[PDB]
Amino acid sequence: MTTPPARTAKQRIQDTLNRLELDVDAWVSTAGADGGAPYLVPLSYLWDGETFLVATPAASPTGRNLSETGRVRLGIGPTRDLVLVEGTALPLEPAGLPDGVGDTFAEKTGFDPRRLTTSYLYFRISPRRVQAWREANELSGRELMRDGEWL
Template sequence: MAVQSTAVRSAEQRRRDLLERLEREEDIWVASADSAGVPCLVALSFLWDGEAIWLSTRRSNPTGRNLGEPGRPVRLSLAHTRDVALLEGRVADVVRVDEVPAATADAFAAKAGWDPRHPRNGHAYAYHRVLLTEVQVWHEMPEMPGRHLMRGGVWTV
């Protein structure tokens, strides 16, 4: 749900709101690019574990290939365009479905409503653990100043 107030939130409140959204929301927009710079934008199920965002997609589709090795950059965004959460990060790990920690896979499946460990239509899936490096959060123009809540992988608030 979007912020309903026109009051400018403190940076601390924006961080609390973001963390609550990461727990509550089911899907996140994922922007990636291949080695030639061809962009791809898709919505994926995700899990926030308090440290990283876990994504899962088929290894053979464009996003799976784009995120297929550690160090690859990724940009993420939660859905509402007037309550922006723009997250940047890097793929820390690409984890096969038979190697993902059981607690992580179980939590992902419970939140997403589907389980990548069980092949869908014969396609192989992988998990991508993304560590955030930059976070911007703002609600419309009044919150543009001070929108950077994380820089260089360190929370500023």
């Protein structure tokens, strides 16, 4: 076993899409609206090929930060074979979520916010930047998406 050469954007994108399809959990990094207030939690996600869907209690720090700021970073994969997403989050009421999407979320993740009595929100997160890199080798071409578009 050795270190593979820096990836072609094409091969990195393929690897990145496979990862997003396979993994169930992401590190979800947010910040308080009032400054110097980082927050980090793991959440299960549903990826559909263009946006992520997650769910958290509306009153959780994360819920509040996604609701109040709309800004999120996702860390997915091993730290030496990572996918980092900068995204924008919009809240969705469980009661309004399309039936099939709700069902798919619950099949993928093993829980269903619609049935929980604690007030949850779903958040649909639209990727704006995506970085993927293993090693220093791959820092330079790490940006795979900028402004919602694969490069």
